[PDB]
Amino acid sequence: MNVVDISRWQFGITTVYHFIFVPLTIGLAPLIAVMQTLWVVTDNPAWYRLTKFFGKLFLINFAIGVATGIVQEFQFGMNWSEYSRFVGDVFGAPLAMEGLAAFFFESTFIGLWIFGWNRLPRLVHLACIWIVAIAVNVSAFFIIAANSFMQHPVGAHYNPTTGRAELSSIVVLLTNNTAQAAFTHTVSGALLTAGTFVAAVSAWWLVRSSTDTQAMYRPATILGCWVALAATAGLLFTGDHQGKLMFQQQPMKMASAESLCDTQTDPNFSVLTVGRQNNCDSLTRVIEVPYVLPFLAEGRISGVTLQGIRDLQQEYQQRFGPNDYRPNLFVTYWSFRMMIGLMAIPVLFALIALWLTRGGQIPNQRWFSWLALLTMPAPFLANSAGWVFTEMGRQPWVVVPNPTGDQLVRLTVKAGVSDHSATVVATSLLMFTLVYAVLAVIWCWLLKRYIVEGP
Amino acid sequence: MVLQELWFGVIAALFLGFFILEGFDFGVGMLMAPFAHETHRRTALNTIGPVWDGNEVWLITAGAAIFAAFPGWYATVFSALYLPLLAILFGMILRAVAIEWRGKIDDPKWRTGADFGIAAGSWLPALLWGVAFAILVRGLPVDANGHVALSIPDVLNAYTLLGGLATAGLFSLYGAVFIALKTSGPIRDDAYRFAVWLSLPVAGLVAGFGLWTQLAYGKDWTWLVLAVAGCAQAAATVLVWRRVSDGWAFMCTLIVVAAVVVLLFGALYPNLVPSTLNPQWSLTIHNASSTPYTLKIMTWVTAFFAPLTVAYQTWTYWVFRQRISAERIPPPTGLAR
Ligand SMILES: CC(C)=CCC/C(C)=C\CC/C(C)=C\CC/C(C)=C/CC/C(C)=C/CC/C(C)=C/CC/C(C)=C\CC/C(C)=C\CC/C(C)=C\CC1=C(C)C(=O)c2ccccc2C1=O
Ligand code: HDD
Ligand code: HEB
Ligand code: HEB
């Protein structure tokens, strides 16, 4: 492949590895704070063991979560030097502000929480995990707002004197509609990942114990299932806020989730589509469910018109010049079925687990124990698919032009790449992939060893 | 203008804090292997246990500050120095997971792999960061278009290699006096044993690299910084032969590490990426900075959180200020392989 394609894969594979542990870290930190808070108030030793058990698993995930984010901090200047200069006046502020407002807090107080069990007071030690639980959300907000500037640039001017986008208002950049919608959606997505993780592990031990520990994992199962259900409700509301934003900001991405080819009124959402989806003209649709795209685009079931990919292709050529504005249809289409479809397993598991644990009942079915294990990777993969559709859906724009903002504030992926050779980026891409793959296997093995071991 | 010059020192201070805090963190990592030549390795590791994450963020904050304040500086050094920075990230990644996962599994082979990750995350950053800063002071072949086209001799030369060894040796001495202050007993005595052996050879590397930077790239006012470094190094050299003080010994070594950062940044002024082909094409703090509004907006955030960051980070070291010995180390609570 060429330099641009290799650089795209590298920024992709490494940061996808990063978002394997990030959603667990964001959601689990408040959960452990809840368990620790209940132990202080209720003086229940069952919650203390839950804090030590799930806290142990959090530290394993937290350590590899930090490691996978180190490269991303300097990755912008290594492989996207041209992109870094263009938006450095705007894009660098959220990255730097998160360093002193969220990264310094969640990394300093995490050490106090680990080594301060017998040194710090109970009230002070409890606040240490709450600060970490808050700082991870603060870090998510700033890192999403910077990415939301790519999706919907606001508060910036082109300043044709120099070839870079310049910040005009920091309030507008932080209060972007895309930033707030994506932040609340990712946090809701992170809560589902940890809520399912806590529920699945606790439910797995309930069957194992039946075939007190039962007293301990039962409250965690109830807490985990309700958080997952609450996160599912949040994902629907925030997911409804995001689709609407997608419609008026990135019409290409809205039709990318449909593989729409012509401008039709009230299109039908197709569950499955055969073929490699190159040209799109010959696409075959299976199980077309209506009243879905109209409701996600403008919030109404009928009367919504969506521009096709083909129609938008020539429209973009008349304003931005001759270019291939067609994203990867096969990847974006199936990564979107994946984000959505992967709600049934977590939601399905939560509903069942609550039904089997009603009135103090302890489940003992063997299939229920196996259901929890398969439910664990569902939110992890759904979170990965959600951000993939966001990044592949905006191709080939690294900075999507704002329809209601400055037209000149935009950049393509090819024009934002650095001037490296095909062998230098490939060597870094190869060494990044194997190192993260080995750590991912160790991370998965470490969690399995401690889950079966228990307290 | 003012904000442009002010943010040059803020980024230097962030790198100053990174070298002061992560300096002994690297020194501990490269001193674990000679300690065995298991209990001593865990005692030294627990000294930087609850502070290694916070210490590291200073590099992350410094890297992100450069991105926000000087977009041209961020996109030039990290683009040109792709290979030396690649190995820096490789080590850091291993150390970020080896420290936490070392005690998870109780198995001699498991700890052997964890020790390699800590060593990789302590040797490469100690050596390559000194080379990376020496490259900036020496300069890069930057043309008018902003490209670099880096070559092999522009990275591995006499000046850059000396800087890498000096910083790595200084960090090893920095970690030697840090363990002697954070530990007591036989482990503390071993820290002074390596400190004496790392006193004279390290002093020659720091003095040789400091004099070379001063005579080739230093300014008139930077002579005082080098004089303080010499005085601090001589004071730190004599404070280990006789262990009169642990804190003074650590404080004197702290000044030596701090003076190197000031000397490197003092010579790297006002240029950010000096051009070896034409000094007019060099990247400065004026043609590669952000707008005053961006620097202004970041000034209020920095003036509120950076002083606040030092408030609890210092308190974090105060919480764990008690020295740890071999008898204070808890038994290994690691699962069987
Ligand atoms: C009810 C139910 C099962 C619903 C879901 C099933 C469904 C409806 C559809 C999915 C099934 C089908 C037919 C296709 C999959 C759809 C699809 C391609 C989704 C995107 C792929 C995706 C989200 C993968 C998840 C990756 C993941 C978490 C793997 C496990 C974690 C581990 C240990 C390693 C993964 C990291 C790795 C080695 C590679 C990551 C590659 C990925 C996923 C993204 C990066 C990436 C991709 C995918 C590009 O296409 C690309 C194209 C051009 C330039 C750059 C890139 C790029 O960087
Ligand atoms: C929505 C959440 C989210 C997203 C989209 C990202 N991150 Fe992240 N990042 C986290 C959420 C997060 C976190 C959850 O806050 C982590 C994981 C564990 C941790 O300590 O912080 C983290 C850690 C983390 C660290 C470790 C800092 C430390 O604690 O020592 C760095 C340097 C980064 N990230 C940088 C990035 C960059 C440069 C990204 C974009 C390319 C990025 N992250 C995407
Ligand atoms: C800081 C901000 C940011 C962020 C946050 C992010 C976050 C993220 N991400 Fe990103 N990216 C970016 C910035 C970013 N990003 C960029 C700039 C780029 C370049 C452009 C392209 O290449 O596309 C990318 C690219 C990319 C990719 C590739 C695509 C292509 O190329 O085609 C991928 C796959 C991804 C994923 C991802 C994820 C999963 C996530 C979650 C974590 N990404
Ligand atoms: C947890 C897991 C998950 C889930 C479950 C989900 C579920 C869902 N979802 Fe999601 N997402 C996600 C994860 C997710 N998700 C992500 C990660 C993302 C990226 C970030 C943001 O926010 O953007 C998204 C994104 C997104 C969006 C936007 C796109 C763009 O902008 O690019 C939308 C519209 C949606 C919808 C939705 C829905 C409707 C649903 C229902 C089914 N999402």
Author numbering:
A (entry chain A): 1 to 211, 217 to 460
B (entry chain B): 1 to 37, 44 to 343
Task: Pull verbatim passages from the article behind this deposition.
In this light, new lines of evidence point to a crucial role of the cytochrome bd oxidase for mycobacterial pathophysiology. This quinol-oxidizing terminal oxygen reductase is encoded by the cydAB gene cluster and is a central component of the branched respiratory chain of M. tuberculosis. During infection and proliferation, the cytochrome bd oxidase plays a crucial role for mycobacterial pathophysiology by maintaining aerobic respiration at limited oxygen concentrations. The cyt. bdMtb is structurally characterized by the presence of a pseudo-symmetrical heterodimer formed by CydA and CydB. The CydA subunit represents the catalytically active component of the enzyme complex, harboring the three prosthetic heme groups, and the quinol binding and oxidation domain (Q-loop).
Cofactor assembly and oxygen reductase activity were validated via UV–Vis spectroscopy and oxygen consumption measurements. The three-dimensional structure of POPC nanodisc reconstituted cyt. bdMtb, in the as isolated mixed-valence state was determined by single-particle electron cryo-microscopy (cryo-EM) to a resolution of 2.5 Å. Despite the close structural similarity to the cytochrome bd oxidase from Escherichia coli (cyt. bdEcoli), the absence of a CydX subunit homolog neither affects cofactor assembly of cyt. bdMtb, nor does it influence cofactor composition as shown by our cryo-EM structure and spectroscopic data. The cavity that harbors a stabilizing UQ-8 molecule in cyt. bdE.coli is absent in cyt. bdM.tb. Instead, we identify a series of Trp and Phe residues that occupy this space. They form stabilizing van-der-Waals contacts between TMHs 3, 4, 5, and 8 that render the structural quinone unnecessary. A distinguishing feature of the mycobacterial Q-loop is the presence of a disulfide bond between Cys266.A and Cys285.A within the QN region exposed towards the periplasmic space. Our simulations demonstrate that the disulfide bond rigidifies the disordered Q-loop segment and reduces flexibility between QN and Qh1. We conclude that the confined conformation of the QN-region sterically hinders an interaction between substrate molecules and the highly conserved Glu263.A which is involved in quinol binding and oxidation in immediate proximity to heme b55816. In proximity to the disulfide bond, within the cleft formed between TMH 1 and 9 we identified a bound menaquinone-9 (MK-9) molecule. The local environment that forms this previously unknown MK-9 binding pocket is composed of the heme b595 porphyrin scaffold, Arg8.A and Trp9.A of TMH1, and Met397.A of TMH 9.
